[PDB]
Write a protein that binds this DNA or RNA. Structure first.
Ligand SMILES: [K+]
Ligand SMILES: [Mg+2]
Ligand SMILES: [Mg+2]
Ligand SMILES: [Mg+2]
Ligand SMILES: [Mg+2]
Ligand SMILES: [Mg+2]
Ligand SMILES: [Mg+2]
Ligand SMILES: [Mg+2]
Ligand SMILES: [Mg+2]
Ligand SMILES: [Mg+2]
Ligand SMILES: [Mg+2]
Ligand SMILES: [Mg+2]
Ligand SMILES: [Mg+2]
Ligand SMILES: [Mg+2]
Ligand SMILES: [Mg+2]
Ligand SMILES: [Mg+2]
Ligand code: NA
Lengths: 98, 203, 215, 214, 144
RNA sequence: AAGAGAGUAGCACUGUUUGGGAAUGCAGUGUCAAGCCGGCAGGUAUUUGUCUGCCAAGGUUAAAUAUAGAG
RNA sequence: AGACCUGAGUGUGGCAGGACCACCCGCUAAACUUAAGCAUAUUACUCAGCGGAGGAAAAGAAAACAACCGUGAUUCUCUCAGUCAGCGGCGAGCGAAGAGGGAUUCAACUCGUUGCCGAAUCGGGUCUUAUAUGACCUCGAACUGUGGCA
């Protein structure tokens, strides 16, 4: 239920008055849902091939206790702070579950 | 299905097992010719993704190209004119190596039609791509509604005109909207549109 | 000697003029009246061949974007899926009886949907829909008499079935109330405008004032 | 765009006791060493070659175009101006001349000729017939061999009923729904002789309006 | 037309109005706007004082449809009323309703003497315009 | 009940191109993702939180357009 | 001794090669000139060079605009606009896009992938007046996946 607009050109909820309608569902909203089968397949492959030289470096830094240095290493390799934070979280989970 | 496991395995090119397999293959490729015909593709899942089918009339080749930048072919490294045009080693070609591999196969075997290509391997001095081609005179190709469009004469040597996926990449056709306004039909067509002098009858 | 003139910016420093050494880059319009005749002749030929179908398929009514054209109406590309469902026609079937369908458009409002639904219902009642084979007519198909009594729409916009665009009517003269004669309209409008304009400055002042409450 | 410049010509320079105009290369043709590329040279390029993007056409204000048509129509109602332009109207009963609608049902050219002689308009068409002659000058080489003068103009309510009046030399047909200023004032001079049909005459008030009614 | 030009009058003058001294040569003083600060400085400073230099902030990707806002004054309102409705508008009687958006106007300004009371629908309004129309006997209705 | 194109997109250096301006597009090398709080775009750089629109990395497709030294 | 994999020789049936090149697609790519000098800039992402098609080519079905009362593939035209957008020894100069009125428009489809099947597919031979989207055979190709349904 979108917020009804006022009748004027300025302020909060400005604009011409109509009867707004809610957004229709789409097939594009299936993205952002969990992918259980895709996740299970990735787990099988990750078990088979193991770790990588980049992940071993992050493993050692986390073991010592240099979390900030681990993020700096990941950010340089992956080029994005969001990508770097996801990589560090994944290695932390794997070490805990091992 | 089995596609997912093959697809996810090829997303781990940095693992120990994948690096071992690629290292042995690269050594084998180093001792072959520049162009080699294959009975079956080495990445069947990737080949089918870009338009390969296990049927008569489809062929696969492996093509080798040399890595590095381009060197201007000027005698003794002497350029003339303004100093803005100097430089012999630091300039780069304006088309990618994926499309150079396709054009080399196309110009060599003129009775085939190039369809697509994909990445296979690399080393310190060489790059390897696999190219999918179709024979347009075969009965099975000409009677297949999904592929017989390539028989028409307007698709001759489509890789030399930059109409493949790799050719579209360096033309800027992966972009739309405000990021591609000056090259959208083509770079030349946009320039002609913006630079011709217009004379209306009653101005 | 130059005097008091404007500074020229004529923009003519490239090789556009055809000469003994240049191909040039020009465009002229000497074919304008001939092309006008050609387009009309093709339209007349197409009408004769497709008779008695209308030349233009049905199209919806949409609102122009941007505050400059906020109040105007025009013709869109095709009817939306929600409009078709409300009218009661399948999208694939509707395309075979001269109705344009656009799957990208969304409604976001009820006034726009109701207008376009009304257009579809008016058009469906005026359709004739010749039977596939005359010997065996199916359900909801025009009889022979309606078939021979059929004409062709020629309107450049396909309005012979529904009509023109619809806008609200102008207000009649009326009498001023006394709230209208006492309210200060600039004061009302300015206060609302200032709430958005100085939202950030007011928030910072509140935060500093709240911070001075550590006691 | 290439005319007169399709040579590989070059100036000889000073010190050869000749003018500095560019000259033609080669030998053995009697053209070698001759002048080239100049607007003063034989076989050279003309000065300021003509281009196709010259402004051939013109724009005219809509109100001014309607003003001219109205003025040229009012001039046709004055017999002094009609005679001054050159028409022979000495036998015409009245000006402007209005005739019955029955002339639209004619089908034979002989009937049209009899009608023209009855209303006294045959003198002007005879004047056009005698004036036919071969044009003087280069114009007769360019599909303009014959010239003639302009006769009367007959105005009809539409573009129908003209079979009997076509093929008569020296007569012009017009439609009241679209009057042409190039026909109402030939050569820029007002006072054309016009014959009106009753149906076309009665539409003038609606087409042009009055001084108060639009 | 070529027959009205000065070149027709100059056939036989040998110099066409450019002088025996000085002559008519190609591009003395340079091409275009060259020399704006050397040997053409006096002309530029005298007639175009604000040509060289910068001023103000920048605005990337300006969309002029967002800033569309035409204005009309209080003294020109009768140009939009019906040809009859004016001249018989009173204080406490029925009054014509004017919509500025339908006529292509956005803001109402308050210059001049109002000639007839009315009800005006507008997007923006100035403080003086609101005061004057209220005193006359009209009103302003805000619209979006 | 599931899924939707990986040395791909991104990042660094270098070069070129653009009106695109703390970087519009592209190329070479190095590095190299996400998808149990996804990805791309929203014309001033960074970190964090909302909102809006879309869902790349495979393919075909008439008409309205050009013929600037062709047949 | 025999399979599979990789690779040769011959035979049968086919295709490529050169020309044209005004317009079109991809690469490569100047200088004269202007700046009253000149090196960044400009001429110009132009001329010259190499490759490739057609009767047109290219583009085309949103990882698009916008910030509204919202539009809805591509192409072209007027206009936006020589721009109180922007770039530039901020000099000489250069320079677009959304929106709006139109031309055209019964304009849209598909592979891989996911789920259910699993040679139902292809080539060759014979027959039906038929090198059938038909039928029968085929220790031929194809299960390292051709086809059919959602
Ligand atoms: K990459
Ligand atoms: Mg033409
Ligand atoms: Mg020449
Ligand atoms: Mg000559
Ligand atoms: Mg002088
Ligand atoms: Mg002197
Ligand atoms: Mg995708
Ligand atoms: Mg295409
Ligand atoms: Mg050739
Ligand atoms: Mg040809
Ligand atoms: Mg020159
Ligand atoms: Mg100079
Ligand atoms: Mg010099
Ligand atoms: Mg060239
Ligand atoms: Mg095409
Ligand atoms: Mg430029
Ligand atoms: Na000079």
């Amino acid at each position: 239920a979108p917020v009804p607009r006022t009748g004027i050109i300025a302020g909060f909820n400005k604009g011409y008055k109509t009867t707004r309608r809610a957004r229709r569902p789409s097939s594009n909203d299936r993205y952002a849902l969990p992918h259980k089968k895709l996740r299970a397949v990735k787990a099988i492959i990750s078990d088979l091939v193991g770790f990588s030289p980049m992940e071993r470096r992050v493993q050692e830094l986390l073991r010592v206790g240099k979390d900030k240095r681990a993020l700096k290493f990941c950010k340089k390799r992956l080029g994005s702070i969001k990508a770097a934070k996801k990589r560090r979280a994944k290695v932390e989970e794997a070490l805990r579950q091992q | 299905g089995s596609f997912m496991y093959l697809n996810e395995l090829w997303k781990k090119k940095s693992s120990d097992v994948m690096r071992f397999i690629q290292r042995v293959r690269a050594w084998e490729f180093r001792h072959q010719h520049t162009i080699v015909r294959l009975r079956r593709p080495t990445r069947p899942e990737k080949a089918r993704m870009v338009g390969y089918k296990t049927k008569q009339g489809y062929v696969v080749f492996r093509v080798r190209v040399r890595r590095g930048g381009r060197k201007r072919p000027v005698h003794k490294g002497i350029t003339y004119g303004k100093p803005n045009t100097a430089g012999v080693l630091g300039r780069k070609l304006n088309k990618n190596n994926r499309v150079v591999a396709e054009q080399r196969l196309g110009k060599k075997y003129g009775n085939l039609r190039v369809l697509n290509s994909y990445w296979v391997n690399a080393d310190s001095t060489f790059l390897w791509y696999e190219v999918v081609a179709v024979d347009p005179m075969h009965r099975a190709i000409r009677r297949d509604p999904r592929i017989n469009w390539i028989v028409n004469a307007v698709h001759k040597h489509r890789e030399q005109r930059g109409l493949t996926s790799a050719g579209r990449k360096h033309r800027g056709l992966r972009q739309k909207g405000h990021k591609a306004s000056k090259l959208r039909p083509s770079r030349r067509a946009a320039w002609r549109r913006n630079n011709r002098m217009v004379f209306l009858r009653k101005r | 000697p130059k005097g008091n003139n404007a500074i020229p910016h004529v923009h003519q420093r490239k090789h556009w003029n055809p000469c003994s050494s240049q191909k040039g880059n020009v465009k002229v319009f000497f074919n304008q009246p001939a092309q006008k005749q050609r387009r009309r002749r093709l339209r007349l030929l197409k009408a004769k061949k497709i008779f008695p179908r209308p030349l233009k398929a049905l199209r919806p009514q949409v609102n122009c974007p941007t505050v400059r054209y906020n109040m105007k109406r025009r013709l869109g590309r095709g009817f939306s899926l929600e409009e078709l469902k409300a009218a009661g026609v399948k999208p694939r079937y509707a395309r075979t009886i001269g109705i344009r369908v656009d799957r990208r458009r969304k409604n976001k409002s009820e006034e726009g949907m109701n207008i376009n639904v009304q257009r579809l219902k008016t058009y469906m009642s005026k359709l004739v829909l010749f039977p596939l084979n005359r010997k065996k007519p199916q359900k909801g198909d025009a009889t022979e008499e309606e078939v021979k009594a059929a004409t062709q729409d020629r309107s450049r916009y396909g309005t012979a079935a529904v009509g023109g665009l619809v806008t609200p009517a102008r207000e009649a003269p009326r009498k001023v109330t006394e709230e209208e004669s006492t309210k200060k309209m600039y004061k009302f409008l300015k206060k609302n405008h200032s709430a958005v304009r100085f939202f950030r400055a007011r928030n910072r002042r509140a935060a500093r004032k709240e911070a001075k409450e550590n006691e | 765009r290439l005319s007169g410049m399709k040579h590989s010509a070059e100036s000889w320079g000073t010190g050869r006791a000749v003018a500095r105009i560019p000259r033609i290369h080669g030998g053995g043709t009697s053209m070698s060493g001759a002048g080239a590329f100049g607007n003063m040279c034989r076989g050279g390029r003309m000065f300021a070659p003509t281009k196709i993007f010259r402004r051939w056409h013109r724009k005219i204000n809509l109100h001014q175009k309607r003003f001219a048509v109205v003025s040229a129509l009012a001039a046709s109602s004055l017999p002094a101006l009609v005679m001054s332009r050159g028409h022979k109207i000495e036998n015409v009963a009245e000006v402007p001349l209005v005739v019955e609608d029955g002339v639209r049902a004619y089908e034979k050219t002989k009937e049209a000729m009899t009608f023209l002689k009855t209303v006294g308009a045959i003198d002007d068409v005879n004047r056009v017939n005698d004036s036919r002659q071969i044009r003087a000058g280069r114009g007769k080489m360019r599909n303009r061999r014959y010239v003639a003068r302009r006769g009367p103009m007959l105005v009809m309510p539409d573009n129908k009923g003209t079979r009997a009046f076509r093929n008569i030399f020296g007569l012009d047909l017009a439609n009241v729904n679209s009057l042409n200023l190039l026909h109402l004032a030939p050569g820029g001079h007002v006072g054309r002789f016009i014959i009106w049909t009753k149906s076309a005459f009665e539409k003038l008030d609606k087409i042009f309006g009055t001084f108060t009614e639009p | 037309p070529t027959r009205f030009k000065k070149t027709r009058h100059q056939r036989g003058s040998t110099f066409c109005g450019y002088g025996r001294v000085g002559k008519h040569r190609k591009h003395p003083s340079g091409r275009g706007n060259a020399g704006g600060e050397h040997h053409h400085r006096i002309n530029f400073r005298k007639y175009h004082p604000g040509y060289f230099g910068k001023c103000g902030m920048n605005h990337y990707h300006k969309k002029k449809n967002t800033t569309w806002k035409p204005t009309i004054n209080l003294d020109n309102l009768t140009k939009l009323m019906a040809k009859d409705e004016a001249m018989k508008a009173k204080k406490g009687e029925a009054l014509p309703v004017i919509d500025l958006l339908a006529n292509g106007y956005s803001k109402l300004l308050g210059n001049g003497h109002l000639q007839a009371p009315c009800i005006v629908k507008a997007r923006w309004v100035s403080k003086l315009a609101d005061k004057k129309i209220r005193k006359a006997g009209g009103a302003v209705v805000l619209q979006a």
